[PDB]
Design a protein around this ligand. Structure first.
Ligand SMILES: CCOP(=S)(OCC)Oc1ccc2c(C)c(Cl)c(=O)oc2c1
Length: 118
């Protein structure tokens, strides 16, 4: 059993940066990959970034060059560094983790990211 706790959302101006954290607890040794997703109101979730235990990363085209996914195995934490945020990036961001040989999946509770000048 794996649980995911997220943090780091909030308000940010266009062009600003935020870092999201995805802290894993439980049988974290079984986690194979972890990914970042986002969902806007009334839309399907959108894949953003993926990372394996070895550190291999994969990105969606909408965030390449701006977002960086990383993982700290000692802390069981997956990070999403989001640079040059745009109003289009406003959504609730979720992290997932595939564990038990990629046969189980756990989702974080989500964190709201709003890109606005006010
Ligand atoms: C949401 C947290 O995700 P992460 S940092 O994994 C991202 C892919 O979870 C871990 C953390 C530690 C380990 C260790 C020590 C071993 Cl030996 C292993 O096989 O898998 C791990 C997976």
């Amino acid at each position: 059993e794996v649980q995911l706790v997220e943090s780091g959302g909030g308000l940010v101006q266009p062009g600003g940066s935020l870092r999201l954290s995805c802290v894993g607890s439980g049988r974290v040794r079984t986690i194979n990959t972890a990914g970042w997703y986002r969902q806007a109101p009334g839309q399907e979730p959108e894949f953003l970034a993926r990372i394996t235990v070895g550190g291999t990363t994969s990105y969606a085209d909408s965030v390449k060059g701006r977002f960086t996914i990383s993982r700290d195995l000692a802390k069981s934490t997956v990070y999403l560094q989001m640079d040059y945020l745009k109003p289009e990036d406003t959504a609730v961001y979720y992290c997932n983790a595939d564990f038990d040989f990629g046969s189980r999946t756990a989702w974080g509770q989500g964190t709201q990211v709003t890109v606005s000048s006010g």
